[PDB]
Amino acid sequence: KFPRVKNWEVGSITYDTLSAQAQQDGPCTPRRCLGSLVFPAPEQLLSQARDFINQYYSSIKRSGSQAHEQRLQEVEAEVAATGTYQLRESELVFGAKQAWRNAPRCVGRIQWGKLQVFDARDCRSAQEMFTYICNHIKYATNRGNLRSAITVFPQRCPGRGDFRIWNSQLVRYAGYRQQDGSVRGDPANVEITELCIQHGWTPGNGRFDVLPLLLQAPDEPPELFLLPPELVLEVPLEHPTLEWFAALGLRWYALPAVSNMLLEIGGLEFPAAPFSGWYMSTEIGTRNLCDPHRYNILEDVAVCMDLDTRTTSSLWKDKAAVEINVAVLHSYQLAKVTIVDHHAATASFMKHLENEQKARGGCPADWAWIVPPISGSLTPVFHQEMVNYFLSPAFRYQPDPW
Amino acid sequence: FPRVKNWEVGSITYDTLSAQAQQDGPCTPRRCLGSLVFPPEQLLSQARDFINQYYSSIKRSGSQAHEQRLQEVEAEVAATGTYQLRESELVFGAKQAWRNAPRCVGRIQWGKLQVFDARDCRSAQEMFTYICNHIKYATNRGNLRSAITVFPQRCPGRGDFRIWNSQLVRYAGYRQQDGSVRGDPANVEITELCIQHGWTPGNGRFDVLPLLLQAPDEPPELFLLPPELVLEVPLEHPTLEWFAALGLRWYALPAVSNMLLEIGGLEFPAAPFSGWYMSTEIGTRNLCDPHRYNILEDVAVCMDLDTRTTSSLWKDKAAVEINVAVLHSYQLAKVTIVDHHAATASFMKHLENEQKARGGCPADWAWIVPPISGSLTPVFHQEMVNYFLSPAFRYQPDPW
Ligand code: HEM
Ligand code: HEM
Numbered sequence: 001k002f003p004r005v006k007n008w009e010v011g012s013i014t015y016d017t018l019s020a021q022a023q024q025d026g027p028c029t030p031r032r033c034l035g036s037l038v039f040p041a042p043e044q045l046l047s048q049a050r051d052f053i054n055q056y057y058s059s060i061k062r063s064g065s066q067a068h069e070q071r072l073q074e075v076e077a078e079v080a081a082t083g084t085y086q087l088r089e090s091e092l093v094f095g096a097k098q099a100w101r102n103a104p105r106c107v108g109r110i111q112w113g114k115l116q117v118f119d120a121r122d123c124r125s126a127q128e129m130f131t132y133i134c135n136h137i138k139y140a141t142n143r144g145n146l147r148s149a150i151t152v153f154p155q156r157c158p159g160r161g162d163f164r165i166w167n168s169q170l171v172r173y174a175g176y177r178q179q180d181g182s183v184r185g186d187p188a189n190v191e192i193t194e195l196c197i198q199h200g201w202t203p204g205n206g207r208f209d210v211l212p213l214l215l216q217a218p219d220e221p222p223e224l225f226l227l228p229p230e231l232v233l234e235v236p237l238e239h240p241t242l243e244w245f246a247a248l249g250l251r252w253y254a255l256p257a258v259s260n261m262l263l264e265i266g267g268l269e270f271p272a273a274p275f276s277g278w279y280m281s282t283e284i285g286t287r288n289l290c291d292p293h294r295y296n297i298l299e300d301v302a303v304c305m306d307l308d309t310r311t312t313s314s315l316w317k318d319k320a321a322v323e324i325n326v327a328v329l330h331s332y333q334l335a336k337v338t339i340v341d342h343h344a345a346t347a348s349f350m351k352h353l354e355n356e357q358k359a360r361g362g363c364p365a366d367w368a369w370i371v372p373p374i375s376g377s378l379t380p381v382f383h384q385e386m387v388n389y390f391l392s393p394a395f396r397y398q399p400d401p402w
Numbered sequence: 403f404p405r406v407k408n409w410e411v412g413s414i415t416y417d418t419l420s421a422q423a424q425q426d427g428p429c430t431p432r433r434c435l436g437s438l439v440f441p442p443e444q445l446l447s448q449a450r451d452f453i454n455q456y457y458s459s460i461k462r463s464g465s466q467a468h469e470q471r472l473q474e475v476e477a478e479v480a481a482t483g484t485y486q487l488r489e490s491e492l493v494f495g496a497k498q499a500w501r502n503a504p505r506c507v508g509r510i511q512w513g514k515l516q517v518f519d520a521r522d523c524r525s526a527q528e529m530f531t532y533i534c535n536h537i538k539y540a541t542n543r544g545n546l547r548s549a550i551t552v553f554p555q556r557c558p559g560r561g562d563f564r565i566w567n568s569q570l571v572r573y574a575g576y577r578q579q580d581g582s583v584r585g586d587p588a589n590v591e592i593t594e595l596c597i598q599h600g601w602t603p604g605n606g607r608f609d610v611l612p613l614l615l616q617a618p619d620e621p622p623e624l625f626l627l628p629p630e631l632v633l634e635v636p637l638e639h640p641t642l643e644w645f646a647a648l649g650l651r652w653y654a655l656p657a658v659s660n661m662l663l664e665i666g667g668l669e670f671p672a673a674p675f676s677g678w679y680m681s682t683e684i685g686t687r688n689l690c691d692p693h694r695y696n697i698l699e700d701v702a703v704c705m706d707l708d709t710r711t712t713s714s715l716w717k718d719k720a721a722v723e724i725n726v727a728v729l730h731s732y733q734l735a736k737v738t739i740v741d742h743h744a745a746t747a748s749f750m751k752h753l754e755n756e757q758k759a760r761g762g763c764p765a766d767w768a769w770i771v772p773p774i775s776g777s778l779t780p781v782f783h784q785e786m787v788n789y790f791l792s793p794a795f796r797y798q799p800d801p802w
């Protein structure tokens with residue numbers, strides 16, 4: 001009835017009873033697994049809300065109390081009267097933490113309870129929106145001692161359009177399509193860069209130009225905002241023992257702040273709720289810098305290293321990527337900016353898995369996203385079978401507003 | 403029809419072949435178990451479909467011998483219960499089951515498989531000389547060749563041909579006065595049985611285990627593999643002269659001897675297949691897995707790396723040099739080896755071939771992506787669809 005899950009490093013076995021409670025449905029069938037795919041009404045508002053309030057009163061040990069049944073009636077009454085309902089502040093804080101706790105592709109979830117929730121549900125315009133965001137960046141960055149934070153903007157509601165942040169992260173480097181089809185800067189941000197220029201951003205011509213924010217208030221076009229330079233903490237990349245490395249002129253930013261996901265809590269939808277943590281070195285070193293469709297620096301580094309790039313069996317790619325990652329950790333530690341390496345990160349995820357197994361009887365985890373993109377079987381999560389399922393509250397992908 | 407994207411290039415394909423999925427898998431709309439290692443008249447229906455495959459692949463759908471072959475297996479099963487395959491069908495099916503193995507990154511080679519027919523086998527001594535012919539043929543003085551030896555299929559009331567080893571070459575696993583193992587911890591148990599059935603234990607980390615072979619309704623009988631038949635490669639590193647002194651070794655022939663070949667409803671519990679190694683199989687899993695030889699820290703001490711902080715990436719640095727040694731040692735030994743970059747690149751080519759041929763390919767992302775440098779290889783950026791087609795290799799209960 002419940003999936004049996006083996007740990008092959010230790011021999012451990014557990015059963016994931018929490019999987020049985022999966023509130024929504026994923027893309028696999030008994031026919032065919034699609035696990036590897038990146039992108040897989042009053043009645044049903046009431047049931048989602050009822051489940052969430054039940055979770056909330058579970059977490060405060062008031063299950064089935066007077067206050068519990070009063071809240072249930074309050075929400076039903078409000079759904080009948082208005083078609084929606086409003087979260088209390090403590091419910092919002094709990095729901096945003098749960099959403100992080102439930103995110104299956106997050107290796108950083110050992111921290112889920114230490115999340116700083118900024119309530120911006122009273123936000124009114126794109127301008128007030130930008131101020132809230134600047135303060136989030138400032139709080140989360142914290143001069144290099146990064147802190148996990150989420151800012152929750154007003155919920156989707158009938159009659160009004162959504163608050164949206166068009167940028168996928170608060171800090172992104174421009175991607176300038178040049179005349180042939182070769183991108184200068186970050187190729188993943190080609191589209192959002194064009195939108196910025198089309199909305200009157202004066203573009204630069206560097207590889208590391210920070211993009212402006214395109215911020216959409218309800219039923220308004222998007223509005224462009226420049227992030228103050230001294231709010232965007234950045235890290236020039238150098239290598240502890242390859243001194244030509246600094247002449248590559250590579251940089252990355254301190255704050256990974258995902259800004260295009262929808263936060264769902266008890267049926268309510270928050271299309272704008274940017275959250276930020278701190279980086280794992282392989283996101284920057286392996287993925288952002290070596291992905292053939294991103295900065296794609298791997299061969300240029302290998303050539304500088306005097307590796308033989310004419311045969312693959314010399315493993316020049318593995319050697320060059322390892323040093324790129326070394327350079328990222330060293331550089332961040334030098335700059336005194338929070339960073340975790342994939343070994344530290346995957347070991348603490350194992351502790352998370354053990355905490356969650358005791359607390360809820362399992363843990364949604366997407367193995368292919370939890371296993372780092374280099375040195376996979378050298379980390380303990382590689383040898384841990386995982387069960388992937390969708391719990392709510394949740395962060396979800398949503399279509400781009402344009 | 404699943405939409406499948408390659409993120410490196412941005413290309414889209416559709417897996418239309420998924421629609422024909424046979425033995426349903428472990429996943430449901432509510433939970434994905436993709437990461438788990440281990441998830442009679444119906445014989446006619448599976449026999450029918452395999453024959454239909456066979457004649458479609460030789461441009462002979464619905465012509466003469468196809469219709470006729472349908473009636474014979476009708477008659478054979480009608481009279482006796484089971485049925486025998488034509489020798490080419492055994493060959494065509496041994497190859498399709500390779501072509502269908504979603505966890506095999508080496509499937510670009512599927513069409514060049516050598517099938518040794520051993521269906522007329524009768525006992526542990528006969529097996530042993532079949533296996534031995536396979537080993538020496540496949541090894542071929544280090545110029546390795548894909549081979550499968552197929553032993554007699556299964557029918558009720560009588561026993562089963564089985565190889566009690568998971569592979570033909572395995573290293574010993576000796577427990578100690580304190581639990582910890584000298585040798586290979588993944589074999590420890592099959593070492594217990596070999597010692598139990600008369601074998602004299604060595605004292606080494608790389609003692610090649612005997613070969614517990616069993617014929618229907620008969621207890622296993624040990625067989626000592628001839629030392630000249632077991633091609634092995636001492637591991638040395640091209641620039642680290644002390645690596646040789648670590649005294650590490652691996653064997654040349656990866657020969658899987660415990661899986662159940664299944665063609666047209668027929669079950670061959672003994673059908674050992676062999677190919678050649680990918681270097682990460684040896685260097686990364688076999689030697690560096692924490693429950694295998696677990697040499698990673700010992701190699702890092704020799705490289706003077708800072709094992710005190712994980713952020714030195716000492717594990718990654720030592721793993722790459724272990725893999726380099728493996729590739730260098732096999733090449734110096736003139737023994738077929740393929741690195742994970744070359745292998746994954748061929749798999750991409752195989753996906754494109756299988757797309758235009760069969761309209762898709764069953765692929766298990768977690769096992770196709772190599773255990774080091776995953777995202778440096780193109781398979782990482784390739785979405786994949788996993789499903790079960792027949793003919794197929796299957797896992798099966800351990801014999802004992
Ligand atoms: C503080 C340390 C954190 C670490 C080390 C971390 C790590 C990661 C990593 C490596 C991924 C895979 C990303 C990729 O390769 O694209 C990921 C995904 C994700 N993270 Fe975390 N994260 C952290 C904080 C947070 C916070 C604070 C939240 C929300 C409150 C969060 C929510 C998510 C979500 C929803 C995903 C899935 C998004 C996706 O990749 O599709 N993370 N995380
Ligand atoms: C010729 C080059 C070959 C290469 C480089 C290769 C490599 C691999 C690798 C790396 C795996 C990963 C699974 C694991 O390590 O547990 C695998 C799995 C598998 N291969 Fe291949 N292999 C080759 C030939 C063959 C042949 C000849 C057959 C059968 C005719 C075959 C059938 C399979 C099967 C059934 C699996 C899945 C078994 C399992 O994962 O438990 N392969 N192969």
Ligand SMILES: Cc1cc(CCc2cc(CCN(C)C)cc(F)c2F)nc(N)n1
Binds near residue numbers: 257258287
């Ligand atoms: C708060 C936070 C989030 C993340 C994940 C960042 C993230 C990055 C991408 C880009 C694609 N990826 C291959 C690089 C897509 C995503 F959906 C995504 F959430 N990480 C860390 N440390 N903190």
Ligand SMILES: Cc1cc(CCc2cc(CCN(C)C)cc(F)c2F)nc(N)n1
Binds near residue numbers: 656683
């Ligand atoms: C013919 C062939 C097969 C293989 C795969 C080897 C293989 C390995 C395991 C577990 C051990 N693994 C985690 C280290 C289980 C299997 F069923 C299995 F077939 N490889 C290569 N090159 N050729």
Ligand SMILES: C[C@H](O)[C@H](O)[C@H]1CNc2nc(N)[nH]c(=O)c2N1
Binds near residue numbers: 038369785786
């Ligand atoms: C196709 C494949 O599933 C896809 O590229 C996935 C694989 N694993 C990943 N893992 C992480 N952390 N981030 C990713 O973008 C991906 N991409």
Ligand SMILES: C[C@H](O)[C@H](O)[C@H]1CNc2nc(N)[nH]c(=O)c2N1
Binds near residue numbers: 437
């Ligand atoms: C839990 C995880 O699915 C499991 O460790 C798998 C992942 N990929 C693997 N790949 C290979 N080749 N061999 C393995 O044992 C595994 N183990």
Ligand SMILES: [Cl-]
Binds near residue numbers: 256283288
């Ligand atoms: Cl990122």
Ligand SMILES: [Cl-]
Binds near residue numbers: 656683
């Ligand atoms: Cl192996």
Ligand SMILES: [Gd]
Binds near residue numbers: 241242243
């Ligand atoms: Gd230097």
Ligand SMILES: [Gd]
């Ligand atoms: Gd020394």
Ligand SMILES: [Zn+2]
Binds near residue numbers: 034035435
């Ligand atoms: Zn699945």
